[PDB]
Symmetry: C3
Subunit: 329 residues, 3 copies
């Protein structure tokens, strides 16, 4: 029909026009094989209450441990020391509290501060609670310092390297562009406006780019997601293949509707005493774990998907006439 | 033909009926960007042969190290201590055994207990073997304790958080549902029957859910795979987007057809002696490494794949007539 | 037309011939769920300048830390010891150099060797630079030893286990074949020519297979990518499903156009002095990090994609006639 010349003009503009340049269907996909490397640099001062001023080389003292891709920056802490294998009073709790040896005797014990020895002992002159053997003295139940001890970390800076490969199209590139000289990377610092190609990011600015604050986050900790996205049209020059960096808070702020708020964990330092006995320093550290999430797809031109889709274009226009005929009169 | 009205009624029921509601082809795929966090809690008692009763805070003493997603729980061990840099007798082995200094002189040495010094020394009054410098005293060749030292670990419990995102559909959710209050997560424990939405899992129950046993596995160690699966139809409410948890033993039990049976590795503890000399405690730990494997796909409605497939539906029915004609008379 | 019998003979040979056996479109894809395990074995001798001959059990002394999949082998190092919390002279640098207390007073300080105390102190009789509190004595600025301290590592050997699963086709296998006895894996060593099925690889041979050299790489470090590829046609016997191993240097050699050349990082060893004071040994270690990258796809037969494509085959041949008619006369 006369509408058939209109529809044929519509489908030609539909596929070639719509489906190809917009949806780009004429290509075959391939996902990214990725590897990433990070180097945090920076140092941090802390005037501890008693211990006096102290240094923290984010290098060695601040990163437990040195991870594969991701990584965790220490920001806050509760430090218990001179701990040893010994018996001692549980922390004051209605579940731990006792009147005499009769109350202390368990599954919950091993879930709490340590393993319960039947004996009952005074947690202080004022009160009494079940004795347990454990690492003693027990860690003091307190909220983490505020503001953060390693608040200087806002200003630490991380270098992020990222080699990737699309196995299928035997192609591979690195987030560091060849146009970029080494002397520039000697002191550049990423920024969306000025330096998009600087792979050195500032921790504060990472948190911040994410609609967050390194300071209100550094107290109780959290996890920052550093999303890298590799989209490359391989039929285009390999020069136009470029990484986009996005940022995201992953942990939940809301106190309600969650558990283990923020991000922290304990680790220790063991010491062979000159006496031959064991002692350890236990440390509950809060901090920000940065996860580097890499992803992307790519595609060159290809006959099979193209003809596959074009074919469907011709079957589609068949019905287009019935649609035009029912619409028009 | 008359069969053409039958076939057209078949293809309409074939695509819309079969291919769409079953195979759901009318959607576009998107894979999951994932991050996971874990918190193991629990303590464990061990009455060591000589050393007497001892505590092991799965927190600090039990997890080497504190990993990104995955994690490894200590269950069993062989502990060699007071080790130092020094010379000493290899372990009795036909390859190590010697009659005099003539036999000891290598590539295998450096492959064995330590580097071979030519001298030959008696491993005991009864026998003799090549001297080597190494960390000495050498670790005693024995099978790991049975039952497991940290058998209490069956009952440790891990909390598992999992934030995910589909980049394409700018959508993201967390395994912890909003319907779930915090006070519940204060002591809930996952279970298929009662508490499907409790993200706190019990190590025994994880092993167990996998058709295995934490006790027969904890002696010599292994790796548990905790598979999380995120399938979401995004055209449906984001509320129906939910995680399914599956369990799997990854290591091979069979003694034959494998190497490094179960799962263990050695690590050490270094100590600056008051004398200024070095000493270390070497530890071969067996345990269960839990790998959290996250994956899934999703899809909203879309025109391109739909019309693409519908088009093929019309080309398909064309041949359906030749099939009906050859069948019927 | 007469050319229509030619085209129909072309498309039948085009799809069934070209698109199916070559491009294999009649299948549905599924990507790999992977887990990997590694065990490095080997020991290494080092005749240190002063300290004398010394052993390094790649087990405990050589791997910091014991990683999930990937792993890092120590090859070279700069070792600073008896470090303590204290004040001391910065390293000679035009930015650090000073004439008197007036010059020392900062953001750069905290970026450098330590936090600047106003006082100015002589770095030596010859010169003077700003005093800072830090871990002191500062680490000596030198290039890493050459040749590598743990050069013996060329010859260390790693065992690599790899369990994988395609969730969709409920299928899963392991890089260790059932045909392979355990007694063989007791001393086999991978090699392309003789032993393709030996999952024990030699570090030198890994580097080497990659068109590189463990020795010129071990001085300043780098990252080796161990690419495993799982392609399985699941309509074929599950026996033909096999892993291919490829090798790749990931870091950039070129001095220009990069930062943090090679691969190294610092970590420390803490010691409670008999005096009650703290001291630590700081260590900048160069080495080779091996990343095990696993990937692959698979597919069984399927009706939907097949008919989808066949359908497009019939729509395609429609236009083939117009092409043959315009070509031929
Ligand atoms: C090396 O690297 C930098 C970064 O690309 C170059 O600096 C940029 O170059 C252009 C052109 O002059 C300026 O318009 C931009 O402002 C520069 N970016 C920044 C943040 O400095 C620099 O030119 C290069 N050095 C040489 C000599 O090649
Ligand atoms: C908070 O969380 C829990 C878990 O969803 C709620 O307990 C469930 O709610 C229903 C409805 O009463 C019960 O039928 C299920 O047995 C409960 N699950 C378990 C294991 O307890 C609880 O109601 C919530 N608390 C409030 C007050 O909202
Ligand atoms: C156990 O494993 C090995 C490795 O597959 C077998 O050795 C191979 O078997 C064939 C057949 O004789 C030889 O042609 C190859 O040279 C062998 N490979 C190597 C590198 O040795 C060995 O036969 C097996 N042992 C038994 C008894 O089954
Ligand atoms: C940690 O440090 C101090 C100093 O060594 C310990 O001091 C004393 O505590 C002991 C336990 O009751 C007694 O055994 C000692 O005799 C006493 N001091 C001396 C001079 O030996 C203290 O115990 C330690 N704290 C713990 C219990 O972990
Ligand atoms: C580990 O601990 C003990 C106690 O210090 C060591 O005791 C002795 O061993 C030495 C090595 O032959 C001699 O050098 C010493 O004189 C002797 N004891 C004293 C009082 O010094 C023992 O060597 C250590 N074990 C090793 C060798 O690692
Ligand atoms: C590391 O080891 C030595 C040996 O203990 C230290 O020796 C001395 O240094 C001190 C710092 O000025 C003085 O406080 C001491 O009195 C002196 N020796 C003695 C016998 O105490 C040396 O300080 C240490 N190095 C540093 C500063 O880290
Ligand atoms: Gd990791
Ligand atoms: Gd701020
Ligand atoms: Gd049991
Ligand atoms: Gd060599």
């Amino acid at each position: 029909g006369t509408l058939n010349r209109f529809t044929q003009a519509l489908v030609i503009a539909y596929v070639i026009g719509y489906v190809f340049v917009y949806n780009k269907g004429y290509q075959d996909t391939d996902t990214v094989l990725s590897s990433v490397t990070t180097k945090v640099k920076g140092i941090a001062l802390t005037k501890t209450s008693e211990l006096g001023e102290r240094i923290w080389d984010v290098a060695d003292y601040i990163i437990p441990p040195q991870e594969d891709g991701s990584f965790f920056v220490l920001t806050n802490m509760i430090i218990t020391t001179n701990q040893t294998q010994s018996k001692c009073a549980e922390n004051p709790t209605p579940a731990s509290t006792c009147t005499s040896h009769r109350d202390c005797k368990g599954f919950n014990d091993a879930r709490g501060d340590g393993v319960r020895t039947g004996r009952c002992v005074s947690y202080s002159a004022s009160v009494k609670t079940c004795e347990v053997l454990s690492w003693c003295p027990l860690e003091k139940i307190v909220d983490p310092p505020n503001p953060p001890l390693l608040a200087d970390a806002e200003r630490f800076t991380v270098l992020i390297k990222n080699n990737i490969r699309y196995p299928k199209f035997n192609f591979n590139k690195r987030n560091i562009l060849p146009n970029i000289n080494s002397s520039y990377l000697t002191h550049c610092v990423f920024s969306r406006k000025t330096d998009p190609d600087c792979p050195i990011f500032r921790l504060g600015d990472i948190v911040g780019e994410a609609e967050e604050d390194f300071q209100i986050m550094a107290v109780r900790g959290g996890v920052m997601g550093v999303q890298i996205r590799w989209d490359c049209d391989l039929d285009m020059p390999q020069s136009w293949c470029v990484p986009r960096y996005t940022f995201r808070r992953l942990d939940n702020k809301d106190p309600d509707n969650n558990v283990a708020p923020g991000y922290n964990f304990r680790f220790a330092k063991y010491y062979k005493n000159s006496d031959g006995t064991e002692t350890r320093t236990l440390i509950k550290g809060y901090g920000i774990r940065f996860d580097v999430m890499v992803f992307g797809q790519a595609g060159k031109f290809n006959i099979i998907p193209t003809l596959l889709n074009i074919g469907a274009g011709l079957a589609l226009l068949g019905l287009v006439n019935v649609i035009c005929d029912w619409i028009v009169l």
